[PDB]
Design a protein around this ligand. Structure first.
Ligand code: NA
Length: 260
């Protein structure tokens, strides 16, 4: 397809490896580029962990208001929000918002612990039909993003389908889904990624991720005006362990998708 030639050209220009999955819910049509290849999720896995806690809250109605202690020993390699509450508490709602909107790794680790370990996050993915997602490590090491390493990976197709079920579908209770959508729309880390390649009148909710090998990811749900929503996954990784971030590639992929 024309979109696929333009994505392949973007990839060639970039020096790295690009994975894209678009779901157009107006007709459930899909555009894929390396859609079944594995990529390191990096912090985009925080969406699955937040959604898994939201699922628990369908039975434990007050779960999101539960306070969780933040201890000095809990603070890891990137804790912009949790550091503000050391020797205090944050609720699981506040930890979910910090994980999603600031990519706070201590917050993510509290979600993982609430779920009984990374296997509890993977379990939720399996329960909603995602057989590809796997979370293996906690937040300080899950984004090493080593080529060929299956840990902490998924494919663009699988993550696009899962994100659609979580935000537009009914994998979550209606109120939980609405909460996740609100959190994603309030993300603060995405301005240079998918959002930068889209018309300024489209509403976006997204979660970014970055890691070793210049891995630069973004997963988004997109609401154009007067048109059915879209789900877009853009994953990107590079050959050199020390490679720099390339959020521009994700913006460019989004732009190509939107023009198609
Ligand atoms: Na690495």
């Amino acid at each position: 397809s024309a979109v696929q030639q333009k994505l392949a050209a973007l990839e060639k220009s970039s020096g790295g490896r690009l994975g894209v999955a678009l779901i157009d819910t107006a007709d459930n049509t899909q555009v894929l580029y390396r859609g079944d290849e594995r990529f390191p999720m990096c912090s985009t896995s925080k969406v699955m962990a937040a959604a898994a806690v939201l699922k628990q809250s369908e039975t434990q109605k007050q779960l999101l208001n539960q306070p969780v202690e933040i201890k000095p020993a809990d603070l890891v390699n990137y804790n912009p929000i949790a550091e503000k509450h050391v020797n205090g508490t944050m609720t699981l709602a506040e930890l979910s918002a910090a994980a999603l909107q600031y990519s706070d790794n201590t917050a993510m680790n509290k979600l993982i612990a609430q779920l009984g370990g990374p296997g509890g996050v993977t379990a939720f993915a399996r329960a909603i039909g995602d057989e590809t997602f796997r979370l293996d490590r906690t937040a300080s090491t899950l984004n090493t993003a080593i080529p060929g390493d299956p840990r902490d990976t998924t494919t663009p197709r699988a993550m696009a389908q899962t994100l659609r079920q979580l935000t537009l579908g009914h994998a979550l209770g209606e109120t939980q889904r609405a909460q996740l959508v609100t959190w994603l729309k309030g993300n603060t880390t995405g301005a240079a990624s998918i959002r930068a390649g889209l018309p300024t009148s489209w509403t976006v909710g997204d979660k970014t991720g970055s890691g070793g090998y210049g891995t630069t990811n973004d997963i988004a749900v997109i609401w154009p005006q007067g048109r059915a929503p879209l789900v877009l996954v853009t994953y990107f990784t590079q050959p050199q362990q020390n490679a720099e971030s390339r959020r521009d590639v994700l913006a460019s992929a989004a732009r190509i998708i939107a023009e198609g």
